[PDB]
Amino acid sequence: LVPRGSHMASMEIFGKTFREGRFVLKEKNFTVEFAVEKIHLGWKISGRVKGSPGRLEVLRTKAPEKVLVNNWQSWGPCRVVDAFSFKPPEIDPNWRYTASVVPDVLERNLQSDYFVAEEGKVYGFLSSKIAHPFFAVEDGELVAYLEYFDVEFDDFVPLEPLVVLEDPNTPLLLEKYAELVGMENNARVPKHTPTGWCSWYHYFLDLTWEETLKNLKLAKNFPFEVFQIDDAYEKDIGDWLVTRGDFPSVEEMAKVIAENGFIPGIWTAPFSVSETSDVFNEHPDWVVKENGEPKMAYRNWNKKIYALDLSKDEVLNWLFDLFSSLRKMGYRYFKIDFLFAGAVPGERKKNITPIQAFRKGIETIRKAVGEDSFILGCGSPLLPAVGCVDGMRIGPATAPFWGEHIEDNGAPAARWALRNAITRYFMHDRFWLNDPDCLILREEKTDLTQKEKELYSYTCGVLDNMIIESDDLSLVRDHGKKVLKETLELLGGRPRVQNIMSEDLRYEIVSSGTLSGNVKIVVDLNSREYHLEKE
Ligand SMILES: O=[N+]([O-])c1ccc(O[C@H]2C=C(CO)[C@H](O)[C@H](O)[C@H]2F)c([N+](=O)[O-])c1
Numbered sequence: 001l002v003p004r005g006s007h008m009a010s011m012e013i014f015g016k017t018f019r020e021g022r023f024v025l026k027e028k029n030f031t032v033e034f035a036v037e038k039i040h041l042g043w044k045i046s047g048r049v050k051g052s053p054g055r056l057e058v059l060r061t062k063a064p065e066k067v068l069v070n071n072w073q074s075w076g077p078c079r080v081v082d083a084f085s086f087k088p089p090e091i092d093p094n095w096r097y098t099a100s101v102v103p104d105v106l107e108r109n110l111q112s113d114y115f116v117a118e119e120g121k122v123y124g125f126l127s128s129k130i131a132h133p134f135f136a137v138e139d140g141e142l143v144a145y146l147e148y149f150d151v152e153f154d155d156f157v158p159l160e161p162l163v164v165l166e167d168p169n170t171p172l173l174l175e176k177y178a179e180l181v182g183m184e185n186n187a188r189v190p191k192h193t194p195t196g197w198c199s200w201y202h203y204f205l206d207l208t209w210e211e212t213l214k215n216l217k218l219a220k221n222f223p224f225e226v227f228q229i230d231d232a233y234e235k236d237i238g239d240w241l242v243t244r245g246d247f248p249s250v251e252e253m254a255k256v257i258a259e260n261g262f263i264p265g266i267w268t269a270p271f272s273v274s275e276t277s278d279v280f281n282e283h284p285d286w287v288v289k290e291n292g293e294p295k296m297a298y299r300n301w302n303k304k305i306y307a308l309d310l311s312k313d314e315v316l317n318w319l320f321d322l323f324s325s326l327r328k329m330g331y332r333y334f335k336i337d338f339l340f341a342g343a344v345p346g347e348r349k350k351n352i353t354p355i356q357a358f359r360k361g362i363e364t365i366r367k368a369v370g371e372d373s374f375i376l377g378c379g380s381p382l383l384p385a386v387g388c389v390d391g392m393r394i395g396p397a398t399a400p401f402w403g404e405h406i407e408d409n410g411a412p413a414a415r416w417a418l419r420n421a422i423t424r425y426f427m428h429d430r431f432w433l434n435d436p437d438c439l440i441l442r443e444e445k446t447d448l449t450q451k452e453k454e455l456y457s458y459t460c461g462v463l464d465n466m467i468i469e470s471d472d473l474s475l476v477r478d479h480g481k482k483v484l485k486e487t488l489e490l491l492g493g494r495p496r497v498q499n500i501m502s503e504d505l506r507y508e509i510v511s512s513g514t515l516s517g518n519v520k521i522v523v524d525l526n527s528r529e530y531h532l533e534k535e
Pocket residue numbers: 075095200230231267337378379396397410411412
């Protein structure tokens with residue numbers, strides 16, 4: 001049944017003592033109508049709100065000491081922290097909005113987006129369609145909020161539902177939470193998971209068409225379905241159909257890839273336009289603003305990057321035409337990246353939330369590419385994308401190195417990429433297909449050891465995650481090939497991370513019903529060791 005106790009009586013829901021029922025809260029500026037209803041292993045708080053709810057407090061309870069917190073987007077940590085020893089992070093002004101969509105919170109208080117967990121307990125919002133749902137630890141209390149970013153609603157709109165789940169099996173609760181999210185959002189969980197190649201983690205921005213063609217030819221000896229060109233081909237951020245260097249046209253690239261027998265894939269950052277791009281210089285009015293001027297969304301590639309205003313029909317028509325063109329060229333796999341830009345707070349043509357704008361953008365992309373195109377989100381708000389993407393990057397960038405000296409701050413490192421694949425495992429086959437980022441299996445031009453390559457690869461396999469390789473294929477020999485083969489034999493199961501609240505970077509992961517039967521891998525991300533059991 002449902003959690004009952006002294007701790008449940010101590011909570012407040014919209015400022016009211018917690019109990020089951022149906023309630024109305026009329027304030028100066030807003031009205032909320034909500035129900036507190038029993039569900040399996042928990043309570044669901046749902047309802048509707050009108051007026052100017054602003055930063056709306058939904059739930060308040062005493063903070064646990066140890067909490068699993070979650071960043072709103074792909075690259076940000078999902079990790080256990082000590083809620084009482086928390087000190088605000090230094091916020092990088094070039095990357096504010098990767099850290100938080102409400103950075104005023106993160107500068108003062110511990111923040112968790114969408115959900116937070118403790119041993120035996122999960123608090124989780126089922127959707128982010130209009131509001132941004134988050135938790136803050138405020139002077140020793142856990143507070144759940146729905147952020148409406150100053151938008152007013154003349155008529156009722158639905159609250160994002162909040163569940164409070166209790167059971168000693170914390171992994172089970174996170175899986176249940178994720179099943180509910182999936183149902184709430186009509187999640188896409190493809191029956192088939194693509195394999196493939198990605199340029200980025202060998203060539204980076206220095207990819208050439210000449211190196212691409214060499215890899216296209218070698219890829220015929222590898223079990224790759226998709227062949228994906230990453231960042232490098234494009235003249236500027238926003239100018240997706242203008243190529244640079246020795247690259248032919250985007251259309252020509254797709255024709256060569258498909259002639260060679262692969263599904264063509266391509267990277268874009270579709271909600272981003274650089275200060276130097278044609279599209280921005282032609283259409284300065286297409287971006288999110290602040291005090292009526294272009295608002296920097298982030299800085300990357302040594303340029304100010306602006307966010308497209310996805311409330312504008314002109315912008316949506318441009319995006320539709322871009323992605324429709326890509327589809328007509330033969331691209332059927334789309335890595336759409338830096339998606340957080342589309343949800344930055346600021347001034348938009350329409351008075352809608354940044355989450356409402358974001359969802360209009362990704363829905364447009366989905367309509368343009370069609371149902372038989374695979375969409376892989378990256379650098380993306382997680383909950384708002386459920387129902388639209390097929391796959392989602394759920395960790396920071398991996399790297400051809402373990403990252404001994406790299407802090408847990410979203411900078412590239414195999415070690416922190418893999419941690420997130422583990423701690424967000426429960427989203428897989430519920431929200432979408434989890435992308436744990438690319439396997440790096442080459443045995444030159446890398447500092448990864450054989451054991452580190454095995455650890456990363458076999459973990460991803462056990463988790464049933466997407467398996468994409470990113471290497472100069474000339475440099476992948478017997479070991480690399482064997483690791484890929486054995487990885488693919490570990491797919492197909494239902495994984496569980498048995499000790500999700502671990503604080504020592506050691507994880508016990510089982511998966512039932514894989515192509516190799518019931519398997520278990522125990523990993524130590526500090527010593528870089530694993531123990532794998534099969535059958
Ligand atoms: O230093 N950074 O905060 C940062 C952030 C993101 C990032 O990777 C993204 C960019 C790109 C290309 O620009 C790749 O597609 C990655 O797979 C994607 F995860 C990288 N990166 O792998 O260079 C670096």
